[PDB]
């Protein structure tokens, strides 16, 4: 690895993420998010599923 090499010979760091689903409960979840809370109006609420 030299700094003056061509783009096809320069070092590239590769990280491969493998996603699997097993019978055990899935614990690596994506972020769910949240909106601002609005009170005193007829709204559709989704609290913790």
């Amino acid at each position: 690895f030299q700094p003056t090499n061509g783009v096809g010979y320069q070092p590239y760091r590769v990280v491969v993420l493998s996603f699997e689903l097993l019978h055990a409960p899935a614990t690596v979840c994506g972020p769910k998010k949240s909106t601002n809370l609005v009170k005193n109006k007829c709204v559709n609420f989704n609290f913790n599923g």
């Binding site: 097993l22 019978h23 055990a24 409960p25 614990t27």
Partner: protein
């Protein structure tokens, strides 16, 4: 899911279980996903 429920109670009975009511609160839920069929208590020795 491994559910661990626990309750701490202050008693003054010397030998047996006291008679009364105490509901156990849920303490921790564990995502283990494994088979469990046997258990064993862990004690502490006293060394001198």
């Amino acid at each position: 899911y491994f559910k661990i429920y626990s309750k701490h109670t202050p008693i003054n009975l010397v030998r047996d279980l006291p008679q009364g009511f105490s509901a156990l609160e849920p303490l921790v839920d564990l995502p283990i996903g494994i088979n469990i069929t046997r258990f064993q208590t862990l004690l502490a020795l006293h060394r001198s």
